[PDB]
C-alpha cells in the first residue's frame, strides 16, 4: 500500500525533476513514469515546451501549502541518485497534472514501479483528444 509523506520544496530544477527536502535531507526528485519536454536535455538542450512544462512544475510546486512525495512499490532512486516518485502539490499529483494539459507523455513504464500507470495514460488520452500543447 503506497503512502504519502511530507516534504518540503528546495528548488524547482526541470519540468521533470525537482529538488525537495525529505526526513531532513536535500534530494533530487524525478517525477515517475512522465516524459517532459526538458530545457537541460542531455543532448538537445533546450526542446520545444520545455520552458512551458518546466514553469508549469514550478509554479505548481512554489504557490503550494502541503508537498508530499508517493513512492511506488519498486526502486526508490535511478542510477543517478535521484527519488523516484509521485509528488503531490496540495492533494494533486504534479505527475497526472502535466499530462492532463499536454505538457509530458506518459514515459517507458518499468514494472513493478507503475502503480498509477493506467490513470496517467487515461488523462494522456484525454489530453491528446483534446490537442493541448504537444498534442496540438
Same mark, same amino acid.
Given at each position: 500500500?503506497? &503512502?504519502?509523506?511530507?516534504?518540503?520544496?528546495?528548488?524547482?530544477?526541470? +519540468?521533470?525533476?525537482?529538488?525537495?527536502?525529505?526526513?531532513?535531507?536535500?534530494?533530487?526528485? #524525478?517525477?515517475?513514469?512522465?516524459?517532459?519536454?526538458?530545457?537541460?536535455?542531455?543532448?538537445?538542450?533546450?526542446?520545444?515546451? +520545455?520552458?512551458?512544462?518546466?514553469?508549469?512544475?514550478?509554479?505548481?510546486?512554489?504557490? /503550494?501549502?502541503?508537498?508530499?512525495?508517493?513512492?511506488? %512499490?519498486?526502486? #526508490?532512486?535511478? %542510477?543517478?541518485?535521484? +527519488?523516484?516518485?509521485?509528488?503531490?502539490?496540495? +492533494?494533486?499529483?504534479?505527475?497526472?497534472?502535466?499530462? #492532463?494539459?499536454?505538457?509530458? %507523455?506518459?514515459?517507458?513504464?518499468?514494472?513493478?514501479?507503475?502503480? &498509477?500507470?493506467?490513470?496517467?495514460? %487515461?488523462?494522456? /488520452?484525454?489530453?491528446?483528444?483534446?490537442?493541448?500543447?504537444?498534442?496540438?
Amino acid at each position: 500500500k503506497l &503512502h504519502k509523506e511530507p516534504a518540503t520544496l528546495i528548488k524547482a530544477i526541470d +519540468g521533470d525533476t525537482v529538488k525537495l527536502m525529505y526526513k531532513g535531507q536535500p534530494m533530487t526528485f #524525478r517525477l515517475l513514469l512522465v516524459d517532459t519536454p526538458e530545457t537541460k536535455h542531455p543532448k538537445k538542450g533546450v526542446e520545444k515546451y +520545455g520552458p512551458e512544462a518546466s514553469a508549469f512544475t514550478k509554479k505548481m510546486v512554489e504557490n /503550494a501549502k502541503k508537498i508530499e512525495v508517493e513512492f511506488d %512499490k519498486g526502486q #526508490r532512486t535511478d %542510477k543517478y541518485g535521484r +527519488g523516484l516518485a509521485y509528488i503531490y502539490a496540495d +492533494g494533486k499529483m504534479v505527475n497526472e497534472a502535466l499530462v #492532463r494539459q499536454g505538457l509530458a %507523455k506518459v514515459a517507458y513504464v518499468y514494472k513493478p514501479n507503475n502503480t &498509477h500507470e493506467q490513470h496517467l495514460r %487515461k488523462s494522456e /488520452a484525454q489530453a491528446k483528444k483534446e490537442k493541448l500543447n504537444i498534442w496540438s
